[PDB]
Design a binder for this molecule. Structure first.
Ligand SMILES: O=C(Nc1ccccc1Cl)c1cnc2ccc(C3CCNCC3)cn12
Length: 266
């Protein structure tokens, strides 16, 4: 990974924060960047996880995967420097822009996410935490997968209601469990950031899914899109589409956009 000298980086505005560091908007010398820091006194595990995220991101080069500019590791606090995504997290963005996009734009966002996920899957990377909150959006409406590492635990044991049944029941996370999650993201995007399963508890969601229930059709959702998200939610992993299938299908729909005028019954 590229080692960046601190004189080349200015932090301007905090845009995110946690117990162990913050995320800033800043400039890199001059281009806008995001800057994630690690606080002094970090543990060995913290360092491995922090620099681990940068190491994973630095292995990737794809339009729909957040681009690493480099790291500051020789000076402290340590920093990861990425491209700056002007519209922030997809979940919050959709909820602040409810109804403001065409169906074709929404489907385009999903194709981008699916292309990023295909690339990760093919690169032997299982995300485990695919959700609108972990996707970022630039000023071209390009959606990029973020949130990399191995630093994660399933809630009550990573939220349950985004996770595939096999990952919950026996800890089997694969690209096919990411496809399940992608189905949930599809529903997030087509609903402008509705919370999956609304106020159902985690245990009610699991029981509902095990009994065959699935999320209902979003309002004004193309039939083909709802059909695709339902296939992502097949109980049997081998019946789910691969990302390659999802990319292919979304591409065809986008290239024949009249196909999106046929709506699922709400
Ligand atoms: O996180 C970003 N880059 C990043 C990714 C992985 C590791 C290190 C970094 Cl610096 C990033 C880029 N643009 C934005 C724009 C907004 C935000 C917000 C941070 C807080 N929650 C909402 C999104 C983050 N970003």
């Amino acid at each position: 990974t590229t080692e960046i000298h601190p004189s080349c980086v200015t932090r301007q505005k905090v845009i995110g924060a946690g117990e162990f560091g913050e995320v800033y908007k800043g400039m890199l010398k001059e281009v806008p960047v995001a800057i994630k820091t690690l606080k002094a006194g970090y543990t060995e595990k913290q360092r491995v996880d922090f620099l681990g995220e940068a190491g994973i991101m630095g292995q990737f080069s794809h339009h729909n995967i957040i681009r690493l500019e480099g790291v500051i590791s020789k000076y402290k606090p340590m920093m990861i420097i990425t491209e700056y995504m002007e519209n922030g997290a997809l979940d919050k963005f959709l909820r602040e822009k409810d109804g403001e996009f065409s169906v074709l734009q929404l489907v385009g966002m999903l194709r981008g996410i699916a292309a990023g996920m295909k690339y990760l899957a093919n690169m032997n990377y299982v995300h485990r935490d695919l959700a609108a909150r972990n996707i970022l959006v630039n000023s071209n409406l390009v959606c990029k997968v973020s949130d990399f590492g191995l630093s994660r635990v399933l809630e009550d044991d990573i939220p349950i209601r985004w996770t595939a049944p096999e990952a919950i029941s026996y800890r089997k996370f694969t690209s096919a469990s990411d496809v399940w999650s992608f189905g949930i993201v599809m529903w997030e995007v087509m609903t402008y950031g509705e919370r999956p399963y609304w106020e159902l508890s985690n245990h009610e969601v699991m029981k509902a899914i095990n009994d065959g229930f699935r999320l209902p059709t979003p309002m004004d959702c193309p039939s083909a899109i709802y059909q695709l998200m339902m296939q992502c939610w097949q109980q049997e992993r081998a019946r789910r589409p691969k990302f390659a299938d999802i990319v292919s299908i979304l591409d065809k729909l986008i290239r024949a956009p009249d196909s999106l005028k046929t709506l699922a019954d709400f």
